[PDB]
């Protein structure tokens, strides 16, 4: 038999695999399939947090103009997260997707100025390039290595028209004077589900380099690399859709037989 | 609708179809009680098997399964062999033979390749069947492509029978995948399912196989166009709306 341990593994797997904007529907399907409310909110608490960190969930805090992203990089513990731009911690309710309890948080450090410079350039980059995108930029001393991590999210949820979509990108610049190494992953997921279930899942990896100069110049060079790469990626996706529509899809099946008319089923059945 | 099977089917509508097979497997693991009903209600990509006797390919799905064996439409035998596998009546087998032939021609005319199979089963006051079509690439081209057609028809004959009721539920699964330096990995996959029913005349000039063929052809032509709109129109527009 399937042990409860494999079961919880499954409920948690299903929840972490919910498409964008559909966490609640998936959670409630899994709730009803296990019929054990306290086991679920026990054995699956990790999955709720995992989902929101994987998805870069944006959240509005009462008191602050700027939304912030839930990511692994801002995990403060105890269901609390860092807002490095507004310089607060807040409580995040992973089930309700609700921010509460903002409290001032100390973000001062030697790297704050490089983080601030990258955050300023990035924020302008994001507002210009995404209809309602949000970004969060973190500064971490990781291997004694100073690292800037820029996370970008943009989603569009239209459940009433049976579709939801989300773009996430994650950009790591390890600030090792004189040549900083750049690593990114761009991801897209789109789900359409009127009378079916069609998804696009896409990702692209980026490797690059930039010369470390001043904070404001290094930031500008960082943003250029981001813009060029996110532009090429979007461009190429659309080129791929055209090619798929023009070639592969057309080859899988004809619109009609060579006669250019539907089948005469009498003639089929007669030989 | 709050019912467990409706929840399970709802999950299948939301979970990534890129993992369609493991999703079903995990779901049956979570709710074994529903194993038979999910095996019956959850479409899975078709798998191709080889009939040694006739040297013809056939397709595997839940509908031609008994235990761990599948029945061929060409030879009418199970693989691996079974001692009392479920068999259509001698009567219904003959129609299944006519239907397989008819749908092998339909496949050639629309698909110019691939593989077809038709499997019929008796019902109390008629019969039912599935018409399956699989057309893939071999995986060597830049853009990988696979089409699964799963057409499930229910025929309820009247007291003559010079009229019958046909209910058709059709699923097409379409899978496209490419790895290009410009776009990174791109996997656009999934399925659409539509249902219709019609009363038709059954006569020698319009037999069951003719009526079913017309319904399958009409429905498949419509789903093809909808797939084109959703895959290459709607999802692309959503992508471009994100940035």
């Amino acid at each position: 038999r399937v042990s409860d341990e494999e079961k919880v593994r499954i409920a948690a797997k299903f929840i972490t695999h919910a498409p964008p904007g559909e966490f609640n529907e998936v959670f409630n399907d899994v709730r009803l399939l296990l019929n054990n409310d306290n086991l679920l909110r026990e054995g699956a608490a990790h999955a709720f947090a995992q989902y929101n960190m994987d998805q870069f969930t944006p959240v509005k805090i009462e008191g602050y103009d700027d939304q912030v992203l839930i990511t692994e990089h801002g995990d403060l513990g105890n269901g609390r997260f860092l807002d490095p731009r507004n310089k607060i911690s807040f409580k995040f309710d992973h089930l309700r997707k609700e921010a509460s309890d903002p409290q001032p948080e100390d973000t001062e450090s030697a790297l704050k100025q490089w983080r601030d410079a990258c955050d300023s350039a990035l924020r302008a980059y994001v507002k210009d390039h995404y209809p309602n995108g949000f970004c969060t930029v973190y500064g971490k001393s990781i291997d004694g290595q100073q690292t800037i991590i820029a996370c970008i999210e943009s989603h569009q949820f239209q459940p009433k028209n049976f579709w939801n979509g989300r773009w996430r990108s994650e950009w790591k610049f390890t600030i090792t004077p004189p040549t900083a190494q750049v690593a990114a992953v761009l991801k897209i997921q789109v789900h359409y589900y009127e009378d079916g279930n069609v998804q696009l899942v896409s990702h692209k990896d980026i490797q690059d380099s930039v010369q470390v100069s001043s904070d404001v110049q290094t930031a500008k060079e960082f943003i250029k690399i981001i813009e060029n790469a996110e532009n090429e990626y979007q461009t190429a996706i659309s080129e791929n859709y055209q090619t798929m529509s023009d070639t592969t899809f057309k080859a899988l099946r004809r619109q009609l037989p060579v006669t250019r008319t539907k089948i005469d089923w009498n003639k089929i059945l007669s030989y | 609708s709050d019912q467990q099977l409706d929840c399970a089917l709802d999950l299948m509508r939301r979970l990534p179809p890129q993992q369609i097979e493991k999703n079903l497997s995990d779901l049956i693991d979570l709710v074994p009680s529903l194993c038979e009903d999910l095996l019956s209600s959850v479409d899975q990509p078709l798998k191709i098997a080889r009939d040694k006797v006739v040297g013809k390919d056939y397709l595997l799905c839940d509908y031609n399964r008994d235990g761990d064996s599948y029945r061929s439409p060409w030879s009418n035998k199970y693989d691996p062999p079974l001692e009392d596998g479920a068999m259509p009546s001698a009567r219904l087998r003959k129609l299944e033979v006519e239907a397989n032939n008819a749908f092998d021609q339909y496949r050639d005319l629309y698909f110019e390749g691939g593989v077809s199979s038709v499997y019929l089963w008796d019902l109390d006051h008629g019969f039912a069947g599935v018409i399956l079509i699989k057309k893939a690439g071999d995986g060597s081209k830049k853009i990988k492509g696979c089409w699964d057609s799963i057409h499930v028809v229910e025929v309820q004959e009247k007291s003559s029978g010079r009229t019958a009721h046909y209910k058709l539920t059709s699923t097409v699964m379409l899978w496209l995948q490419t790895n290009k330096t410009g776009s990174g990995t791109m996997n656009l996959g999934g399925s659409l399912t539509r249902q219709m029913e019609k009363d038709e005349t059954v006569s020698d000039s319009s037999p069951h196989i003719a009526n079913i063929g017309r319904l399958v052809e009409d429905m498949e032509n419509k789903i093809r166009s909808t797939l084109n709109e959703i895959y290459f129109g709607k999802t692309k527009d959503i992508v471009n709306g994100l940035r």
């Binding site: - | 409706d6 399964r65 761990d68 479920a86 089963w121 019902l123 039912a128």
Partner: peptide, 21 residues
Amino acid sequence: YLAHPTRDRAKIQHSRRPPTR
């Protein structure tokens, strides 16, 4: 909230015989 037409399409009407497992 979604319709599930594959629940109400014809089903096998002898008793199947499950796969392993």
